[PDB]
Assembly symmetry: D2
Homo-oligomer: 450 residues x 4
């Protein structure tokens, strides 16, 4: 005979898996007692987490957009329809002009389903810092012909002229805008002009700034791109989920009353990528986050994110640090550590030992040997930190890098040699204690408060 159902299936994690329960609890405290500046990270709501960790995880569905609303799909169909319309609402889209598929598992498979839908294998692709196909060679560089466009070597802004030169020569079927680690806004108009001239589709991956986009705090790629993709856990502050927006209806002139043919191509491609159906709990959670993202409180959050990023950059620069483009217009700063005589690996490893989490990051000129760190505001803004709080974060960064330099001097620049300085280091423990003392002062979303 079987075990009783409750013994395995209705008992708490603390009873079933004490080891995992303990590590989750330890990671819970670590998120609270530290400064999370990873740009793609956020802290989502308890309400999202409840939809995420619910019986929606048990519901299979075909993987095409639900249209039945009856039978066994009565409820996921309304959930998904609420997700779609909240999606269109949060990004201020006309549903007669824009459709949204909310079935992809994540952003990356959402992108690759989008590419699969509108392109053939080996069709030529351009995106920011998109490898030709160690760093990251995605499916997009392997199965398509990728050529990157690049930021201006000196100013850090996208060379929109070299991009047009590149597009007219290379002739991509598709141009991808919306790379990561870019601290300025995108001239989507120029991207449309450029795509029109070379006959390319224009896709935006707004994964990073989807929250800022939703709050109308940055340029909207929907105004000029044919397709928009995103993940939903970054600045949007939702689950780790994916969505694909595509144009619907009449095309702008070019042509005898022709209409966008995106919907069916995209639906089939996501459907075909969904062995076993979607993560319907992710769709349920996403709908929650989209409703939240349409609130006044979120518009203000997004404003504060930008303002925190700006204040952090101004602090860092006043101490003499090099920020790519010399500032930011979105949620992140890109910090060129090479002028200091530092690599991102050292700064990220020393920060990490002090309960500051940042991402080492390639900066204009690198060759896995990154000379920068990427620094995001959304996570700590969601804990309610304001500009003065991000100035103190800047000081912590100052101390961290000051400490990295001091360790590097006494122990050497080679990474393994530098490593001996992180062992039993008083200044590391002191800085970490200050970070934990500081971080504990702020609230934390994601769990129940009476």
């Amino acid at each position: 005979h079987m075990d009783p159902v409750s013994v395995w299936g209705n008992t708490p994690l603390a009873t079933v898996d004490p080891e995992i329960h303990d590590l989750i609890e330890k990671e819970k405290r670590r998120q609270c007692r530290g400064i999370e500046l990873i740009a793609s990270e956020n802290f989502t709501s308890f309400a999202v987490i409840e939809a995420l960790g619910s019986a929606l995880t048990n519901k299979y569905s075909e993987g095409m957009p639900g249209n039945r609303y009856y039978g066994g799909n009565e409820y996921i169909d309304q959930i998904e329809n609420l997700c779609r319309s909240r999606a269109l609402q949060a990004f201020h889209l006309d549903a007669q002009s824009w459709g949204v598929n909310v079935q992809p598992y994540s952003g990356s498979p959402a992108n690759f389903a989008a590419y699969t839908a509108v392109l053939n294998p080996h069709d030529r692709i351009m995106g920011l810092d998109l490898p030709s196909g160690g760093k990251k060679i995605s499916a997009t560089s392997i199965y398509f012909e990728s050529l990157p466009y690049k930021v201006n070597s000196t100013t850090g802004y996208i060379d929109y002229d070299r991009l047009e030169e590149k597009a007219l020569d290379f002739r991509p079927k598709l141009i991808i805008c919306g790379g990561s680690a870019y601290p300025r806004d995108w001239d989507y108009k120029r991207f449309r002009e450029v795509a029109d001239k070379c006959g390319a589709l224009l896709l935006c991956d707004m994964a990073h700034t989807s929250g800022l986009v939703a709050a109308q705090e940055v340029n909207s790629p929907f105004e000029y791109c044919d397709i928009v993709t995103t993940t939903t856990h970054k600045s949007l502050r939702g689950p780790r989920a994916g969505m694909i927006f595509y144009r619907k209806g009449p095309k702008p002139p070019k042509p005898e009353n022709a209409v966008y043919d995106f919907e069916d191509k995209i639906n089939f491609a996501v459907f075909s990528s969904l062995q076993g159906g979607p993560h319907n709990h992710q769709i349920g959670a996403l709908a929650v986050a989209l409703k939240q993202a349409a609130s006044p409180g979120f518009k203000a959050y997004a404003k504060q994110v930008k303002a925190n990023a700006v204040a952090l950059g101004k602090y860092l620069m006043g101490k003499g640090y090099s920020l790519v483009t010399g500032g930011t217009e979105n949620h992140l700063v890109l910090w060129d550590l090479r002028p200091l005589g530092l690599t991102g690996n050292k700064v990220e490893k020393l920060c990490d030992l002090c309960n500051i989490t940042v991402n080492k990051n390639a900066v204009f000129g690198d060759s896995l040997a990154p000379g920068g760190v990427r620094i995001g505001a959304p996570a700590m803004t969601s804990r309610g930190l304001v500009e003065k709080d991000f100035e103190q974060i800047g000081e912590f960064l100052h101390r961290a890098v000051t400490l990295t330099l001091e360790i590097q001097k006494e122990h050497g620049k080679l990474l393994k040699d530098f490593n001996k300085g992180l062992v039993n280091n008083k200044a590391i423990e002191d800085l970490k204690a200050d970070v934990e003392k500081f971080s504990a002062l702020f609230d934390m979303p994601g769990f129940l408060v009476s």
Copy 2:
């Protein structure tokens, strides 16, 4: 001004989103009051669901197997390490011979990352029913040179000679075993022999049967496949996650001596490169719980019961005269042939759904000739053989009404739908199915007296 953090971020879903909260309750009730026969569906444990809706959803990780065990990764690396070692334990794998990557988002990205690791674009691939309409034309068929092998069109078993025939002519770089609707065990020995005569890598997508593999209730693909992939929510009863197993260590005996398997780094890189923004660490944690639960004698008994329920449901259906593909089952599913009755899968799937019996139409033109039915979900609710025979009776009742609407209201898909309206018989069978479903326990929520 920003909303207080507690207002938007610490307030329960019932308050923040009553609309979604209501729909989740309604769906929660629907899962309790119906018969879930979708072969890929299961009902996972509350403990899995707790690890899933946890602060691991906020944790970024680079997407490479974690080995730091310090700093911001100290805990997920420990969780991830518990996942890997528990994956290896649950499938009885020596760690010196098998490694596992627990980082893919889901089954299909896991597969395609495995294929991307060991193959190049346009490399030749063979899989069951794998296309080269209603069906999935997936990335595997689009970026690789793919050709199916099929079941013997009259026995419904895999035609192993015709497979070696095609494999020797086609020369696939990779052969994939495992199938969504195959009611019989696989001859992984025979596949390995075929793989070696044509120089192929051998990969098993064990997603549907991984629970049975873990319980050693079906053959283990690990004895003969180079790579085994899985999604984890089917018979393994875990989260919707992904996993890639690969061989490590020295290879078997026209190759160099002292040679070793070269899978780990390419697979790791391929998974890492497919993870823009990191893995779902909440899925890795939840899956580590599921793997621990899979390694228990209670789970072995669950898997035995799944097979026996599938068989008992099978014997019932053919006891009434229906045709099962291969005339029975060796795993968690039955594949019911509706052509001898003259009905399509889409018809029986629709009427069943109206009675809170969920099944999937299934190939056996582009019109589905059968119906796929699985035991894992209902077996998870505690059902045993006689209960599945009651399900058989419900299915017999269900299909008898479908033949009564067909032979009366018409056989066209137009004329047939007109008969499922205010249909007394569909109402009463729905009611009986509902009454029956509520009799059984349901995993997924925390019992009141464990809350302490």
Copy 3:
């Protein structure tokens, strides 16, 4: 200053290049004093050679089919038009139904231009013994997805059923019939039926049997194939040139009055393959050979070729030798030497040392280790040999293989070991002398006779 024009440009080969003049003269005598049974070889006419070695070699042309007939192209345009219409005539084609491009350099680039015209890279291809991509891996196996069909393992005939099984499963865009070394005719009807069912184009490479096709001595692939390609020096007995025939005009039903779109696609593809224009001397020579091929004398030649192949096979089999399919219906026999305990390399190398030229050839079951020889009648038929003359050739083959066996016994089966027996071998010199004595008895086309 320059040399006088005549000194380099109007002097004979014997004066300019005595070494080459001598070797050409030596090769001239070798062709006369030997038995050439290479199936793809022929001896073309003096008239073809005069058009081949003429001032047409100096004429550049664009590489699209000539339509001007005025100006600098006045004459190549009529030459090429004479070539096209003689082409259509020699293969009994309706010009409203069939077009012919006569610009390809050779058969292989003609094939690959044909494939390039009607297919995209990686489109799936089937042909007889077509490798999937050492033997021969052509551009067709490298740039397309090739799957072969195969002869029946026991009978040597094409498995037309396994072919249909293969076509319906593999779904090629194009099926190629007309492999080489196949000694029977082709059921082009079944090939059309099979191509119709899998939606494939049907192309025939008749390089080998184009002469027999022209004389209506074998099945005509034009009756069922969409495209026919050929080289022109084999059974057609012309220059080494290429041609591509394609259907023109209405398609058979399937569809609202749709017409074949082959002409422009093929013209452009050959044009694009012709860096520097065509070999206009090859077009001039080809036109000569096509006129010759439409004569009664050629119809009889083609008949005698078949009859010589048959008589040679019957002789070989009566001595107990294994012929694939046990006979022939065209110009060649395929001789399976494995039952004798011999490889094609030994038989071809010993034959070659006796002024018999044959091609070692893979036979059903080989793995560059060929167990057969390919044997063609067209060359020696063109010297006027008849059935009794080919029976004597069979005897020479008998003696040759009898000698190979005897050498292999005394010196071993390993090729290098066998090789020591060909050194200073009386029976080899005797057999060679008999071959030269026999071969000298027959006339030779290709040079001027008063």
Copy 4:
């Protein structure tokens, strides 16, 4: 009954095919009585033509470089060996450092076989004006990932910085130098530097200039390219044949030490695999004659004269005010810019042709802006600088009439053609061009008193 062998096979073309024989005579006369300025055309020697129309056309060869030197291949292997050694001698190549394959049918199959040897499908390729309409979209652009580099749009010279720019961004596996209508020498040193910074193979299609390379009248691509391909009928004055040169032996100094070039076998295999039915051994023999003739001081003086005739023609044209691309020439051709006069290439090419001056329209929309003009053919007939200045005058006369039909009969391609009918001026210039052309010797036939 079979025709006697002498009747069809030993009877001259004048008897067997009077129609073709007549047309060849007429074309023979046309070549003598006009001005041939097609840059790729030459007039080859009678000795080449004898080796070409010879019994080598019947000889089959397997398509691998011949090394038997016995049996049925004893003589072509000796001929082929004379071809290879003479190819190496004519381009001043050490045999220990350079091998050559003389078996491709023609230039374009030679190129594509070279690319197939060292590349894989979709590998990235850069060449001059190489596309990714009126122009050739060839197999190189279709099966490989191709991108052009261009001349500087204002100087007409290769923009070497913009080429290294693209090469470092694009990362071509292969860069191709050589161009059909470039009037200047190539910086093969600069190409090699570019090749090495981006990790490319470097290949020169030297077809247009191989005669000059052999004479050492332009830079040698062999000093810096890994592979050099050529067709042989242009400035080399040979048959229409093909040839692939490749580096052999140790490589130059981030690579292994003692490393050697690995080109020979892959190229041989690629050429062999492209030769269904064997090579054109009559072309290999004829080419061996051409290579011998190229290795002589008389040929060096011919090549010097070709360059000087091109220059002298260039100075003449701009002496009258016309625009040459790059304002002159360093090789065998001039590239005449017709846009400052307001005419298209197609217009001047048509009118010229009507006067027995053959030129090619040439890029400098999809409408040809210029005209390509080469010195090799006319220089082969014995013409020197003042004769080419008379050609310049004929071209000035020719283009002046084209501007007189344009500005009068209309500038549209419709209105322009109406003006080239019974046109007195075109008749008289044709006549003068004809009278002038007949003044010069013509190679290709056997002088009466060498017939002994």
